[PDB]
Design a binder for these strands. Sequence first.
RNA 1: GUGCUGCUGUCUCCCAGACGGGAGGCAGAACUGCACCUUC
DNA 2: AAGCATATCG
DNA 3: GATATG
Length: 546
Amino acid sequence: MPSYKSSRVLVRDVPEELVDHYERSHRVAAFFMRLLLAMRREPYSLRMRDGTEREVDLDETDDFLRSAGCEEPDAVSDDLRSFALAVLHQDNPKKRAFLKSENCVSILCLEKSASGTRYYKRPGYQLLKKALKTDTREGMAAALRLRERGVFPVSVPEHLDLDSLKAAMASAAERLKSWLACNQRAVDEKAAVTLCDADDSPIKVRFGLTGRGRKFVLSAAGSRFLITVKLPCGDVGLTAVPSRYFWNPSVGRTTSNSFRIEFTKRTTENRRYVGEVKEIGLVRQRGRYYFFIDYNFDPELTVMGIDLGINPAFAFAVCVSFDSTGLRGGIGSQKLHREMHNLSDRCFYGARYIRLSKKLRDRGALNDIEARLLEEKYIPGFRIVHIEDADERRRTVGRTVKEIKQEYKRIRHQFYLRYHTSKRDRTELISAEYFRMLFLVKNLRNLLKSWNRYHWTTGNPDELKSYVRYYNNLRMDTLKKLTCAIVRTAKEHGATLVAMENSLLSLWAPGMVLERVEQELKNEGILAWEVDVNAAINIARRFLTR
RNA sequence: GUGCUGCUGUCUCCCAGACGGGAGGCAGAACUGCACCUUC
DNA sequence: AAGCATATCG
DNA sequence: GATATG
């Protein structure tokens, strides 16, 4: 029902108290994850930082449960599982024992807890006020039965206040529920957990106003946020570095436990935005502390047909007669695009010439099709001089890969200079060179992957991950800018309805491009639906017939 | 603030095997442009 | 899988 | 304000 947007703000001088709170929250969250997994008393698998998976048997979980304060698990097993499935939301939603998973911590950890006795929020009590013995869910009944057995108030490894425990339990339950859904999807084929860590896999340490986590206050001074976190040990004050997503912020404490923030998103438009902040998430990434600010926001005949081409970024028609037509995102630099295509082809053919060379080295020519495929296309596409011997051929391939790498670096630098060569004005918002670079890097990653595995016969996870990062980031940026261009063209033309259908399918699944454009068009207030310039005209006409 | 996103100098690890490739850490110069919902 | 609300007694 | 449960 609600709508969210998000951004991170970096904080530099984090006091020791906040770092200790962060680390303790991560440790207790890992403890809760392991405890909930142990309560199911079923064998599972966990993957560590090295990437290999270990399988934990039932005996280790039994030992952990006995360490956590339950001296006789096998005699109370049916209760524990009955509790755990309630926490992970594996019961009927109508009779949910814990609507939010944090609610169990009072039963889990508190000594003098009175949970499970109060009934003021029961609808029957409300109706009697206006004028439970069987109503109790199995999840709460099992928890009470465990508590009265002297078993359930487990020993938390590190002492924390109730609110921080609730936040840690919330994060742990979220991760475990996601893993459990994945495990169900895997078992239904006819699945490994990942314990949270302070640096290798952080959880969002949450601060909230209603009671989940410690309370927080945020204000704005000039162009930066000032955040005060109300830890039990004091009140830590922080100042975030200015962010161009929140360039000129100004906040107001609302009367409904929320902070209204008004900011300016630095773009060409510099449009003002308003949002509501209610929870804040501290996270550590490579030694730097970022607060995830997730803010709610309020979303806002002329029709268009949109065609998502590859050589043009898109073609639009507006309108019966189409008095407005055009293309957006054409080729900007002819020679750059041509060189990009040539290098992509070179890498594509080299990836196969490597395998053919290995086969020749270890077995010799096998059949006519291998030799002909090498001679007609692999030799000139990877243009290179053939060598009969093994090591000389390997050295020639090495020289060819060096040349390819140098050309790739030059092409990347030229593409980067599109925003800094005093010709920024000529540069368009979107162009086909983005997709061409994506294809080029996808082919080049494969080429280097084949090259690195030359030594072994035909027969670490850090390999080439910089290229993976670049590919993913460039693809995300391309999608963002394409969506921006589409919505900008829609809004400038005053359209109210949009109709829309080595290719796009190889870069994205059929869904997320359409879903992203649909969501962004709806957010601005423009409706859209699924059914060159002629294709866009045809799409618009097809929508018009309906 | 995350990216688009690079260049130069320098340093440390890994795969080879004297042809090359891979992952990062610092120090500079240049430009200050274009978009941004994120975690699992 | 998520990025809160509301009641009650003190 | 501190629990507690929608």
